[PDB]
Structures are given as C-alpha cells and as structure tokens.
C-alpha cells in the first residue's frame, strides 16, 4: 500500500547504450524491459521463476560496484527474504537468489541502493525489517554478500517504508539514507568511509508526512555540493529538504501549492539530460496526471507543471527516470497504468515533453 517504487530503471552495465526498467507482474516474476539507443522498446521479459514476490512489489537496481559489466536487482519475497537476480554484459539472467533469511522484511518492502561513496568497490542495499529498523547488507566486487544487519533502533521507521540513498554531495565518502519515520519526521542516517553508522536523525518536523511516503533523493545539479531530498506531505504539496557541505539541514519547503499529490505521492529524481545544471522532480498528481517541477543550478523552482493527460496513472503512481542510455541528451520518465502497461515520457536538452506513450 506505500507508494514505493514499483520500476526501476538502470543502464544494463557493459552494454553502453541499453536501459532496462524493472517491474514485478501480477504473477510476481519479476520483469525487465529494455532498449539500445533510440531503438525499439523490447519485453517485458521474465526473469527467474513465476510466483517469487507479491505482485507490485518494491524493486531496486544498481551496477555492482567493482565489477563494471555487472547489473542487480533487488526486491523481497513472499517469504520476507531479500533476493538479487543480475546480469553479466549481455549474458541470460541469474537468480533471483536469496541475500537474506526469510521473514526479516515485509513481502515486497521498499528498497535501495547506493556505492558506500569512499569505497569505490562497495554495494550498500537497505530497507526497513519487520521490526521497523533499517538495515544494510553489502558486497565487496566479488565477494560474497554480507548481513542485513541493523542500523538504526528496532520501532523506528514502517516496516517496508520507501526510501532513497545518495552520496551527501561536497563529502566524496559520505552516503546518506532518508526515510520517513513512526512520527512523520523525514530522517537521514549517514555513514562517513569504512566507518560506523550515525542517525537517523529528523531532519523535519514530525507529523508532516505520512508514514510510509515516498522518497527520492539527488544532488541538485549544477551546485555540486548540495543534496535534495523530495516527500509530498500530509496537505499534498511536494517538499524539499536540502543539504550543503557538512553544514546543517534546510526545509523541507514546500515547491508546489497545496492539494496537488496525495500525500506520500511516489516521487523520482533526475538531471535533465544535456542540460548539465537543471534537476527535474517527477509525480503523479491526484488527477491522475505526470507532473514535473525543476530548478536550474541555484534558481528558483519552475513548475509543477502536467506532462499528462489526467487519469492515465493512478494517482500517486511509482515513477522512475533515467537516461536513455546511448542517447545523452536524452531524460525518460516511467509509469505504469492501471493494467500494469508501462508507459515512457521523454525530453531531448530544453526541448518539449513528448508522450506519454504506451511501450513494451
């Protein structure tokens, strides 16, 4: 029920030009679709076998760090265990095997990754228990996988509760997560090198957003020291908080009027590709319509602004976005309709939005 994100969309690492976007069917295998280029969209094609996870649950992807022609994707079973499934350059697919013992998440729950930034060979993964602590399992290149373990409190967060990760953007070896927690306060917790974990801390005031919202995380493009972190709020606007250097935290801010998103909408971040200092927020209004909102290097906010027509996504619909790899001026948003169809937006630099058109 969280709006977590249900898509994710990577380069397939090794093959320079290829994006995939994840999914989970009705028939809980998951699913990849893919294109090379400007191409034709390909899938959605099974990977591992039918009836693994819940339908829609969470998925998360990355490149295995240190091995550069590796690609996972991450997301939880029905047994509660999280599970990898990854590709080698153009290679058939392996797993989804299990990284965790059963019953620790919720079927389904929320998950992301990140490198540990300091650590130029290390996979970081994370999502909240059961038992509403977040936890971390990693991977050194090729080694094998390591935890869950705990880092924060048992009690803190909804278990399975959405969250982002991003390098702390001014600090090469900081890497941040964000959750909302059990009072509605956005949290970060942070880890400095090989070191220790520290938070979560608040980072807003608590009962401003629901528990269980959704979160997206992005260095604010152009400004290379600062680090936004989106969560529309109880009243439906779409906040940001933001951080520069080690120095403190600011907002959250609302940067839309109120009433606009459901609260705890899903939302997803991304540079506006080949305009180097622009950085685009994307969800999906109450009306059923694709919005984003932007800022360019350290302007005011633009937008929200519909690149939809209404009622084409459920509100508050999981979003990704990406590059569409081999074309680098080139940003895709991604959603599902009702039926489960994933559909892709586009903008080539400061071009219009083109689409939403309905693809493989």
């Given at each position: 029920?969280?709006?977590?994100?249900?898509?994710?969309?990577?380069?397939?690492?090794?093959?320079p030009?290829?994006?995939?976007?994840?999914?989970?069917?009705?028939?809980?295998?998951?699913?990849?679709?893919?294109?090379?280029?400007?191409?034709?969209?390909?899938?959605?094609?099974?990977?591992?076998?039918?009836?693994?996870?819940?339908?829609?649950?969470?998925?998360?992807?990355?490149?295995?760090?240190?091995?550069?022609?590796?690609?996972?994707?991450?997301?939880?079973?029905?047994?509660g265990?999280?599970?990898?499934?990854?590709?080698?350059?153009?290679?058939?697919?392996?797993?989804?095997?299990?990284?965790?013992?059963?019953?620790?998440?919720?079927?389904?729950?929320?998950?992301?990754?990140?490198n540990?930034?300091?650590?130029?060979?290390?996979?970081?993964?994370?999502?909240?228990?059961?038992?509403?602590?977040?936890?971390?399992?990693?991977?050194?290149?090729?080694?094998?996988w390591?935890?869950?373990?705990?880092?924060?409190?048992?009690?803190?967060?909804?278990?399975?509760?959405?969250?982002?990760?991003?390098?702390?953007?001014?600090?090469?070896?900081?890497?941040?997560?964000?959750?909302?927690?059990?009072?509605?306060?956005?949290?970060?917790?942070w880890?400095?090198?090989?070191?220790?974990?520290?938070?979560?801390?608040?980072?807003?005031?608590?009962?401003?957003?629901?528990?269980?919202?959704?979160?997206?995380?992005?260095?604010?493009?152009?400004?290379?020291?600062?680090?936004?972190?989106?969560?529309?709020?109880?009243?439906?606007?779409?906040?940001?908080?933001?951080?520069?250097?080690?120095?403190?935290?600011?907002?959250?801010?609302?940067?839309?009027?109120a009433?606009?998103?459901?609260?705890?909408?899903?939302?997803?971040?991304?540079?506006?590709f080949?305009?180097?200092?622009?950085?685009?927020?994307?969800?999906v209004?109450?009306?059923?319509?694709?919005?984003?909102?932007?800022?360019?290097?350290?302007?005011?906010?633009?937008?929200?602004?519909?690149?939809?027509?209404?009622?084409?996504?459920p509100?508050?619909?999981?979003?990704?976005?990406?590059?569409?790899?081999?074309?680098?001026?080139?940003?895709?948003?991604?959603?599902?309709?009702?039926?489960?169809?994933?559909?892709?937006?586009?903008?080539?630099?400061?071009?219009?939005?083109?689409?939403?058109?309905?693809?493989?």
């Open positions: 029920y969280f709006q977590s994100a249900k898509l994710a969309a990577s380069n397939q690492f090794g093959i030009n290829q994006t995939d976007v994840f999914a989970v069917d009705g028939n809980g295998s998951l699913r990849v679709s893919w294109v090379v280029s400007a191409g034709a969209w390909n899938g959605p094609a099974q990977i591992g076998p039918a009836g693994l996870f819940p339908s829609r649950a969470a998925v998360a992807s990355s490149n295995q760090f240190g091995i550069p022609n590796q690609t996972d994707v991450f997301a939880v079973g029905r047994d265990a999280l599970n990898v499934a990854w590709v080698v350059s153009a290679d058939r697919w392996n797993g989804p095997t299990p990284i965790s013992a059963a019953g620790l998440f919720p079927a389904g729950a929320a998950i992301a990754a990140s540990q930034f300091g650590i130029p060979n290390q996979t970081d993964v994370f999502a909240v228990s059961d038992s509403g602590a977040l936890n971390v399992a990693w991977v050194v290149s090729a080694e094998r390591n935890g869950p373990i705990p880092i924060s409190a048992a009690g803190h967060f909804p278990a399975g509760a959405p969250l982002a990760t991003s390098n702390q953007f001014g600090i090469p070896n900081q890497t941040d997560v964000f959750v909302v927690d059990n009072k509605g306060a956005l949290n970060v917790a880890v400095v090198g090989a070191g220790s974990w520290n938070g979560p801390i608040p980072i807003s005031p608590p009962g401003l957003f629901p528990p269980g919202a959704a979160v997206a995380a992005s260095n604010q493009f152009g400004i290379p020291n600062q680090t936004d972190v989106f969560v529309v709020d109880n009243q439906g606007a779409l906040n940001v908080a933001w951080v520069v250097g080690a120095d403190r935290w600011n907002g959250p801010v609302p940067i839309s009027p009433g606009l998103f459901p609260p705890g909408a899903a939302v997803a971040a991304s540079n506006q080949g305009i180097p200092n622009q950085t685009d927020v994307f969800a209004g109450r009306d059923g319509a694709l919005r984003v909102a932007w800022v360019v290097s350290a302007g005011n906010w633009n937008g929200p602004v519909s690149i939809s027509p209404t009622n084409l996504f509100s508050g619909a999981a979003v990704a976005a990406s590059n569409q790899f081999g074309i680098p001026n080139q940003t895709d948003v991604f959603a599902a309709d009702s039926d489960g169809v994933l559909h892709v937006a586009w903008v080539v630099s400061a071009g219009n939005w083109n689409g939403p058109i309905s693809i493989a």
